[PDB]
């Protein structure tokens, strides 16, 4: 019943994360949010690259 | 009563984001995720830089 489960459109979390930083926008050296935001993306992109060659068609 | 409010420890958003992503791990060219992921930071890191010189002491 309780709201949860990942893959929540993926954009939902991203949007909420942004709205949060909007308020936490370097309010007091929030570099921590940067390392997190960055680490997520580094791992995110890294996984993207990890894939056997076949076509790699550009997203429409 | 309903759970909300930003800056929820911030990494709380992020954490869930990665977990989400872990699901969307290049599941179907979720390049949109990284676009958001990046946008977040480029907006995040940028604001960080936006600050008058005074000391800029490195985080412990």
Tokens for B17, please give them: 């984001």
How many contacts (CB atoms, under 8 Å) link A and B?
A: 120
A40 secondary structure, DSSP code:
H
Residue whose pair of structure tokens reads 């390392």 in the numeric block = A35
- Comparing CA positions, the residue from B18, B30, B9 lying closest to residue A21 is B9
CB spacing of B44 vs A37 below 8 angstroms: yes
Rg (C-alpha) for chain B, rounded Å, is 16
Handedness of CA B23, B27, B33, B38 (dihedral sign): positive
For residues B21 and B34, give the distance between their C-alpha atoms in angstroms, rounded to a whole number.
10
Q: Which method resolved this structure?
A: NMR
Nearest-CA distance A5 → chain B (Å):
8
For residues B54 and A54, give the distance between their C-alpha atoms in angstroms, rounded to a whole number.
53
Residues contacting A59, CB < 8 A, separation 6+: B29, B31
Residue whose pair of structure tokens reads 């893959």 in the numeric block = A7
Three-state SS letters, B24-58: HCCCCCCHHHHHHHHHHHHHHHHHHHCCCCCCCCC
Tokens for A11, please give them: 């954009």
């Amino acid at each position: 019943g309780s709201a949860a489960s990942p893959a929540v459109d993926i954009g939902d979390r991203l949007d909420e994360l942004e709205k949060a930083l909007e308020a936490l926008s370097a309010e007091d050296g929030h570099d921590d949010v940067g390392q997190r935001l960055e680490s997520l993306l580094r791992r995110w992109n890294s996984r993207r690259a990890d894939a056997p060659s076949t076509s790699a068609i550009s997203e429409d």
